[PDB]
UniProtKB/Swiss-Prot annotation, chain A:
The keyword Transcription applies. Histone deacetylase that catalyzes the deacetylation of lysine residues on the N-terminal part of the core histones (H2A, H2B, H3 and H4). Histone deacetylation gives a tag for epigenetic repression and plays an important role in transcriptional regulation, cell cycle progression and developmental events. Histone deacetylases act via the formation of large multiprotein complexes. Forms transcriptional repressor complexes by associating with MAD, SIN3, YY1 and N-COR. The active site is at 135. GO terms for cellular component: chromatin; chromosome, telomeric region; cytoplasm; ESC/E(Z) complex; histone deacetylase complex; nucleoplasm; nucleus; NuRD complex. The chain holds residues 8 to 376 of 488 of the full protein. It comes from Homo sapiens. This is Histone deacetylase 2. Widely expressed; lower levels in brain and lung. 1D-myo-inositol 1,4,5,6-tetrakisphosphate binds at residues 21, 25, 264.
């Protein structure tokens, strides 16, 4: 039926600033929140403020040295850390900014708090739009991400759940999550992403995991221009077969919005309804679900996408006409919730999508039963 | 009248799936012997098919799957347990002696038939050892290992812009539908039992994708359909398909597991009700490849396909079976035609009309 | 195993002839990525070509023409309108950015391969960016600007008294036949479509001049030739040529515009049928330089030259294509091999034998 949803938000998150010209804008999390307050979605969910996750929590995955660096580095001492910055890949895509460590603590705190709540069966669904930072690695930042809140939340779920399914609909390959779990069968990672001379460079469909994890990493490589009909025709079949073969008892869905049409950095052509169909599909399996944010660089569309996906999580129909809100002028010139696709060419032919699907289905046959 | 080429290899009846397995290639040899005894050989050209090569099979199936089919043997299965799981071979699709050659003969007949139609050397080609519609690019399924129908249609597509595939086996022809699901050059039309039944696919809503949207047609049925209910949906559907799609060749899979008293099927058709489909298709005067399919009550398979060959040849044959090498199998009546059972028809009139009207709406979406 | 070295520059795919122009250097990059993903890099030496210098190019081409190619740019075309006319650049051989560098890289691979063959460092050298057989001493023609084949053959003739050139592009190899038409130190053998077709040369009766009389061989064909027909004349012609001429090196231009389905060509060869020519030439165990050539359905050019690279390596590769950077270009079937079309073969069996007999009469006139 309808589920209990817990939602995490820190009202300070929107003030963190990556720097002039940097495309990652934590302000999109505050726009999302303001928009769903204005639709009245707060009546229907429990809103919690995340704690600041500690270094003890983050070193359940990341190295002590890397977490100590992240605690220590500031724009005023950068000059003393030129060597460490290189080692940990901080200082260009992943800049040093004021309050960097606190931003990581809040992003991480909502994901891990949501995993706790799920483990305690206090909620069916937990939402943390500030999370989803899937590129961070054990000892290095990558792709605007510093601490892998998803890996930490999955580790928390693995205390109570034998098998956890991770699904990643960000336009980029979820490489930090896949690498963390690449040799285990206790997390199956499934990433749909643009592949071919695109960041981060990994996620070929021939990357299937290794050792006990062989067959428990699933990658669906796509080309530019994918649209709702192409996506919707492979996502429900793949996720259904994964559910059937792997039988997870919890699910983590990264809902990166850089896969929408009109994204400043992404090259796909999904609408908000197309993207949100993935949430609807995953919800039908009725498993404990942690939904997380991710990329997304055209901020008016990020706010629309994550507002509508919160409404889907709540089984709540919201009108297309946007309510007035603090960021109303960002949504012009139409002031509607739903977006139109562009006329960009879809380089993903229907035969290509069916062929890749058939190749992954072969691999899913190799799971035990 | 019309010319009929017919394919049969005298070895096909010797392949054996294993003790207890319901698929019996010997039904093909029974069929052939009954038809020879009716004198239907005087009226058609009978050819022994060449064995399809492994290379011909890889026009559709994956190389690793075909190499596996060529390599696996009852005595070596312990070296191939991972590949058996990958390719779904070993249970319902067992490893048996000569498996690969059985696939070469069944495929050979279908492909040879398609070549004869492309060359305009015949009007109709018949391969009762064909019709193995469940096989997939890289997996066996439902007693089928190599999809001879797909390979024959790929061959027709060299010479025909649009090919229509019609499937009256009781099961959804899923391997054929999947092969062509994103093209408009092949329209697949399957009538089948649907609902907690193998293979699980063939929903009314599965209508194709991409350029193939509206070019896959499924008529899902419940248990107990009879000659009258089936014939009142088959003719109008196929007539409207012929009208809207205008194919230049037709492939008809005539799986006989939709007959009353089938060991595995739950339909209530007679031989006449099943063969009415062949008659309807012939009225459109298009190049036609007729293939076999399922059928597990082997005496009724031999009657069905004998009667359908006679329909192909426009020959009325007597209800009294001629003497033949299998005569005792047809006792105690020794008649060609069978009676339906008293099983209940669970397809209500409302149900049938609702499905037919949806399919007509889908057919109106064609250009 | 015979050793194979293969030339490829990663920038070659970025040269662009302009919107709507059928020649697409990107096909070279597609071919490269397919054979990487088949694993064939493990079996061969892969080199980056040098940029051939003006000094190298003027071993054949006029100084004036090379100086013009090294000067001409989209931004200065206005000032070179008379030279564009003189050198035939600006229409079917357009000016584009990097033109000269593209010529340098295509030529660099063929001349470098010939050097490797002369030094007995390899048995076969492959440059799929080469084969630009229409360029003339002082003019561009037919999308070709620098005749890398003529330059490679001049390098071979430093070490080899007699070099055989074989051209299976659908077009007559006119720039190469012209360069060598009055010498017996190169025999040129071209199979091509002839009759109101580019470049208009290559009649059966063009057999060379002077000391080169009888050292040019032309087999003119009509539309629709297929694998069966082509392979029945290629092997006996080449075998007789090898017997009578006894070359010590061979250059084989493998233009893929002779394939079925080519955007500009009218033949009906499959990848197997085209690649059989490579297998035949290899049976003579002579140093061999294999070069590219035309080909305008770029998915089938990548298939052809990938399979011919495998044939050079004595490697069978599966029909199922591996995943690769351009995998969507190979739908709908995603197989390596292609089917022929239903086009009529206008080359009758008597036509092929009669022309074969006429050529065999000329070959008997050799010492
Ligand atoms: N995926 C994702 C999820 C959650 C938080 C951040 C992300 N990071 C990205 O979206 C991203 C976009 C671009 C680039 C890049 C680098 N050089 N060129 N492009 C790198 C990363
Ligand atoms: N359709 C068809 C055509 C041509 C050749 C073989 C076939 N295969 C069948 O007839 C068939 C019947 C039953 C079952 C089954 C599986 N689990 N329970 N029943 C699977 C398949
Ligand atoms: N043969 C070849 C080899 C290597 C590189 C390019 C080539 N050039 C061609 O294939 C070619 C095709 C068509 C035309 C043409 C001109 N007017 N109409 N058609 C001219 C040339
Ligand atoms: Ca992804
Ligand atoms: Ca894993
Ligand atoms: Ca059926
Ligand atoms: Ca179809
Ligand atoms: Ca030629
Ligand atoms: Ca000569
Ligand atoms: Zn992203
Ligand atoms: Zn069946
Ligand atoms: Zn050419």
């Amino acid at each position: 039926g309808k589920k209990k949803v817990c939602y995490y938000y820190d009202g300070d998150i929107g003030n963190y600033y990556y720097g002039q010209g940097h495309p990652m804008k934590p302000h999109r999390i505050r726009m999302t929140h303001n928009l769903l307050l204005n639709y009245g979605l707060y009546r229907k969910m429990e809103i919690y403020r995340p704690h600041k996750a500690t270094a003890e929590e983050m070193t359940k995955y990341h190295s002590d040295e890397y977490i100590k660096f992240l605690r220590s580095i500031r724009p005023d001492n950068m000059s003393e850390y030129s060597k460490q910055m290189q080692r940990f890949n901080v200082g260009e895509d992943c800049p040093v900014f004021d309050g960097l460590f606190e931003f990581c603590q809040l992003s991480t705190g909502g994901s891990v708090a949501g995993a706790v709540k799920l483990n305690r069966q206090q909620t069916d669904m937990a939402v943390n739009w500030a999370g989803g930072l899937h590129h961070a690695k054990k000892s290095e930042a990558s792709g605007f991400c510093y601490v892998n809140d998803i890996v930490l939340a999955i580790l928390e779920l693995l205390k109570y759940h034998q098998r956890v399914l991770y699904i990643d609909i960000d336009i980029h390959h979820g490489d930090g999550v896949e690498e963390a779990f690449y040799t285990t069968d206790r997390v199956m990672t499934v990433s749909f992403h643009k592949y071919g001379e695109y960041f981060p460079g990994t996620g070929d469909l021939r990357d299937i995991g290794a050792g006990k994890g062989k067959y428990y990493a699933v990658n669906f490589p796509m080309r530019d221009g994918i649209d709702d009909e192409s996506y919707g025709q492979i996502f429900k079949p793949i996720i259904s077969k994964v559910m059937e073969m792997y039988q997870p008892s919890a699910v983590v869905l990264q809902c990166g919005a850089d896969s929408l049409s009109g994204d400043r950095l992404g090259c796909f052509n999904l609408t908000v309804k197309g993207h949100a169909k993935c949430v609807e599909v995953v919800k039908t399996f009725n498993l404990p679900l942690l939904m997380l944010g991710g990329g997304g660089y055209t901020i008016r569309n990020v706010a629309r996408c994550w507002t509508y996906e919160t409404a889907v999580a709540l089984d709540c129909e919201i009108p297309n006409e946007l309510p007035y809100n603090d960021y109303f002028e960002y949504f012009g010139p139409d002031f509607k919730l739903h977006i139109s696709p562009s006329n960009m060419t879809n380089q993903n032919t229907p035969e290509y999508m069916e062929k890749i699907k058939q190749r992954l289905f072969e691999n899913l046959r190799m799971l035990p039963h």
